Amino acid sequence: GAEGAERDAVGALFEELVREHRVTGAQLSVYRDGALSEYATGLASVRTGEPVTPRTGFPFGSVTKFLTAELVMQFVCDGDLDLDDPLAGLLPPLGTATVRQLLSHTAGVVDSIEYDEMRGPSYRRFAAACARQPALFPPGLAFSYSNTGYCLLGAVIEAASGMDWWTAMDSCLLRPLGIEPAFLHDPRPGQGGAARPVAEGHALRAGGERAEHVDHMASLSLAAAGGLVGSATDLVTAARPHLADRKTFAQHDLLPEDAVLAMRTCVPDAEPFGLADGWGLGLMRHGTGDGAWYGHDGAVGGASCNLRIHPDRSLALALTANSTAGPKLWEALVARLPEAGLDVGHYALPVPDSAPLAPDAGHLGTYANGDLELMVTHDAAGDLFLTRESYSDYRLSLHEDDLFVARSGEPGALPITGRFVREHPAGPVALLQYGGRAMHRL
């Protein structure tokens, strides 16, 4: 009756919005009321004419972290891996951080580290290279999103099992779920056979009439953080053990209820400022109570991927898209899906109520996350600026609750809403965070 009307409205909504934003191809899968809806449209490649099917694999991007987290949590439940063990005992400063902190981006690892020197399936040499990198702050003091943190989780999985991250991801999680494994880069010889049909990425070029193929360079070492390739339906399947009705899922034993709850349980006193309201083990949270949704986002080149889970309503939905318009399709989907009862949570940055504070000349300094750096400066008039290697200076407004807004001097650049973080109420500024990354005051 009325459920059938809703699935029709969703597919009809998905079709309208894919065309309206001219997405090359997309998949939307919704699990709701115990059953699955699978929508798929458009082109896997514009060059090829090949259509998108539910089999077509899309790059998950950073959505890969939810499966890596799921993989890590499996080893914990078999007792093969300790969520609070220090990394030093697992693989010869960063040695005092924990798997639990890595999962939650609270380990103080920088976001990106050059290891284009990796060639095989082992993450062992990569583990060492992280060690020769200054931490952001001591493990546990603040949220900072880190692809490298999850690449270290690949080394952990490899030392905990005796298999490389690819082999373990395949044999321990993808295979029992029914997911055909595919990767941005697979360094193993492996076996042969027909490869899984994959979607290419696309972006509108100047004067172009439709989005065209775009090449993405993705380093091999990012694999455990972003290298998985699969379908909307695959992501919904991996979400199945997280839902209230998980006893109806035949493979619920694959991820026990206690692990599901842990992945969902957010770290206290470490808000992912500028990305979500909370972060758990491989899931972020948008919203707070009955309105709290969990998931993950990702984008590689001209492709995007979004996953969203509401455990209590036993609802999961995933979107894959293979053009740069994917993100606006996700946004329009979030705003319009309410007209079929699917009110996915939103996250908006705070907008400050108050007037700008007096420019504090103790905020001056250089802040850094790995290679990326920002400078808080002032001019001769004593006004605060944010400088950035190849960008116009931003005007820096300081606000209450240690918030700040940086307005760019070039209108095609985005402004930056972030906050400062102190280690102690009486202490000086030690951190700037925005977009869920921290930057260390040097």
Tokens 């329009």 belong to residue: 332
> What is d(CA 266, CA 223) in angstroms, rounded to the nearest whole number?
25
> What is d(CA 432, CA 376) in angstroms, rounded to the nearest whole number?
10
Cβ atoms of residues 41 and 18 within 8 Å: yes
> What is d(CA 227, CA 244) in angstroms, rounded to the nearest whole number?
29
Q: Is 318 exposed, middle or buried (0-12, 13-18, 19+ CB in 10 A)?
A: buried
- The first and second tokens of residue 301, run together, are 């080149």
- Resolution of the entry in angstroms: 2.2
- The first and second tokens of residue 180, run together, are 């055909």
Q: Where are the beta strands (DSSP E) in 278-338?
A: 278-279, 284-286, 293-300, 303-310, 315-321
What separation in angstroms does the CA of 43 have from each of 58, 234, 261, 269? 12, 19, 38, 44
Q: Tell me which H or E stretch contains 235.
A: helix 232-239
Q: Tell me which H or E stretch contains 252.
A: none
* Pairing assessment for the beta strands 293-300 and 229-230 based on DSSP bridges: unpaired
In the CATH scheme, what is the code of domain 1-347?
A: 3.40.710.10
Give the Cβ contact number of residue 210 at 10 Å. Answer: 12
Instruction: Determine the topology of domain 365-441 in CATH.
Output: Lipocalin (2.40.128)
Give the Cβ contact number of residue 255 at 10 Å. Answer: 23
Q: Where in the chain is the domain with CATH 2.40.128?
A: 365-441
Cβ atoms of residues 280 and 264 within 8 Å: yes
The radius of gyration computed from the CA coordinates of the chain, to the nearest angstrom, equals 22
Phi/psi at 232 (5° precision): -50, -45
Q: Determination technique for this PDB entry?
A: X-ray
> What is d(CA 166, CA 188) in angstroms, rounded to the nearest whole number?
8
> What is d(CA 93, CA 87) in angstroms, rounded to the nearest whole number?
10
Q: Is 198 left (phi over 0), alpha (psi -120 to 50) or beta?
A: beta
- The first and second tokens of residue 403, run together, are 């918030």
> What is d(CA 424, CA 143) in angstroms, rounded to the nearest whole number?
16
Q: Where in the chain is the domain with CATH 3.40.710.10?
A: 1-347
Cβ atoms of residues 385 and 379 within 8 Å: yes
Count CA atoms closer than 13 A to 130's CA, side-chain side: 32
